[model samples]
Target: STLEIAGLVRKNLVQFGVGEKNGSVRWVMNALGVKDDWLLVPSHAYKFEKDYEMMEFYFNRGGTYYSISAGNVVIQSLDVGAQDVVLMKVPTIPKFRDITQHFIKKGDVPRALNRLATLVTTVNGTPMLISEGPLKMEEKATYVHKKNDGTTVDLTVDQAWRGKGEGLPGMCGGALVSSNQSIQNAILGIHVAGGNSILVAKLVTQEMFQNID
Candidate 1:
């Protein structure tokens, strides 16, 4: 389900308007891949608003997401007990892409929750939680973003996952599917760079937040 991560990553990029300047046709065709097993579960504006709230309250008891702090939520992220990165073979709960689409397709909130709950039950126990990627580093998480034109871009953490924002994205809660291959090894044939998707982490428990407060 690594492809699932790529799909969610694409959705996140779309949320931030990665291809709008070009056109919708070009956006639909954009493709991305993480040849390496490592991935960055970079935090989004994990808000409990209209649609987003649906995923939150639903996945609350599920293991993928754990707690909340600083107006953002935290994912169990790594499966601390087992083989770190290799254990992350599973995809994020609820399938990040599905949640986004169901809402976009004139769907309802509860439908996505049903899909999420099943994935949570499928996993054994907190799927391999990898080490957190270092926060605010010069090093960039590397990946391949093949455009619709049959060309590829050497995107890095320095520019991805809302990498360039104000103490946002990963600056708070973040985790990475760890491995020895390193981010550089992922794209296969490029200047090797590693994953970057963390900044700070604090408090742990069954998690919570405010009423949009």
Candidate 2:
């Protein structure tokens, strides 16, 4: 049953201290069956400058940094200088488990286990994704653009970031980082405007995949 699976999922979250940042997990738990023992912790927002004093105070006592945004939980090491961070979307596990259970009921245990394993690897390998950094300049490919004046031109990666006089033509616009959705949208626009392909920098390696539970 959903209630039985939800209970196990809830225990996994608490066991890891990777608590849910939003109400989605709670909603699932409530709809299935509320367990009185399950307790949700309110998220703490940390600003490095203002909270640094308190942060360091906690760090001295071996405290780690944790925060949640847009349903994604991020945990950082106490060594603030290194800025080592790991991210996990806590809701994915329960949600995937719920789906896997559905398949299990259908008597397809292999398919259900395969689905669950994919979710686990994806969540646990996120730290490796962040460490890989942005796409390399050399890997970018040239694309063709149709200009407003009815002229066709080939756009290369260099035009994406170079100054107007340096190498860029007047038709090109500015490039944005891929850190946020807005910037990602701008990158898509650049591609549509005949810019080079936007390659993803992070890839889950075999070692990273095997490291996850």
Candidate 3:
């Protein structure tokens, strides 16, 4: 059921863009490899300014995270609207139980510790299929446009900013999760597109396994 997966996804979700200017920076950090040190946010936004590597990550998202034990993470990007994703490789993933716990408690009711936690990664892709109904993966109509700047925009996207002291304190990094018993989620697109429609960063062809060191 969507509710089940929605709850599952909510468990993996973490908020960390406060005071930051670029929302993408949050995603970039995930792509670079989520750090336990980031749990200690200094200024929220300004602290992330110089943290990124100068290897042109401002443009490179194909990098991978590799692990001698876990395999690899190869990232890809979507061209429909937004692009730049990761499927990289890394060694020894950190303790997600503590990671999620430190940020937001992983969403689960009956079985929390039993279910192996999924690593939350970043994705840049086409305008995701506008999913409706409390955040499950849904396929719906979208209004994509091509700009003279060679960039694409989804007219269907409805980005909302919180009002005075009304919302949380930071930018958001989001994901799309399947409602099936199998657990996982995507790292793109915002969830609040409002009324009958949702904004996803557009999903690229996702696979079940992992690799790409």
Candidate 4:
């Protein structure tokens, strides 16, 4: 009965023009009934627009949704249940270890334990984290540090920053980091995916299903 109702609702929504003409309904359709797959967030908006169709095909057949912008995807995948998780990509393992170490130095074991935790919180509530900088370039980078248990930190770049021109971080990364409606719908789940790992979990519908709806 649930699937039938959901299918009818979706069909009605799609036929009735539920969202904008830029494939937002398609995005919503993709996020339904999702399961095990990764989402790859490219570092640019143009990339997402260019590749959204390909992403839809891939996700329908079991692929992840990844992005460089956070807010966009999250908003698109809002229907995704909370039980779903977003997997994020760390550029390098060494870089991952390096960032992890910073939290250890600061004596915050929990932060280092779950580097993606803060990202989850950020997406859940505020949706944005602006650094105390005037211009976009002037904004400082956000860190995901490691505990002392990882490999040695010397000869490694301990800091990773996200900026407009450089890489994903702070507001820009936040803007890009978002839920993949297609993946969420396909597997009945949504998560962030990088090259080889799950980065963050959006927890979209599961919570709503259990708590709200």
lDDT of each: 0.21, 0.21, 0.27, 0.22
lDDT of 2 by residue, 1-213 (tens): 323332333322321222234322111000110122111111111221242322211100012222234323333221113211122333323222221111121122112211111111012212101111133322243545444576674433321221111111221211112222221111111111222332211111112112123
Q: Any runs in candidate 1 off by more than 4 Å, and if so which?
A: 1-41, 44-50, 53-126, 129-138, 144-155, 159-213
The lowest-lDDT stretch of 10 consecutive residues in candidate 2 is: 25-34
What TM-score, over all chains together, does every model reach?
Answer: 0.18, 0.19, 0.30, 0.19
Runs of candidate 3 exceeding 4 Å displacement: 18-82, 87-93, 97-172, 178-198
lDDT of 1 at 59: 20
Runs off by more than 4 Å, candidate 4: 1-56, 59-189, 193-198, 209-213
Candidate 1, residues 106-152: lDDT per residue as tens digits? 12211211111100001122222222222222323544322246654
Query: Per-prediction count of colliding residue pairs?
Result: 7, 0, 28, 63
Candidate with better lDDT, 1 vs 4? 4
State residue 39's C-alpha deviation in candidate 2, in Å: 22
Residue 106, candidate 1: Cα error in Å is 45
Clashing pairs in 1: 78-129, 78-130, 79-128, 79-129, 135-198, 141-157, 184-193
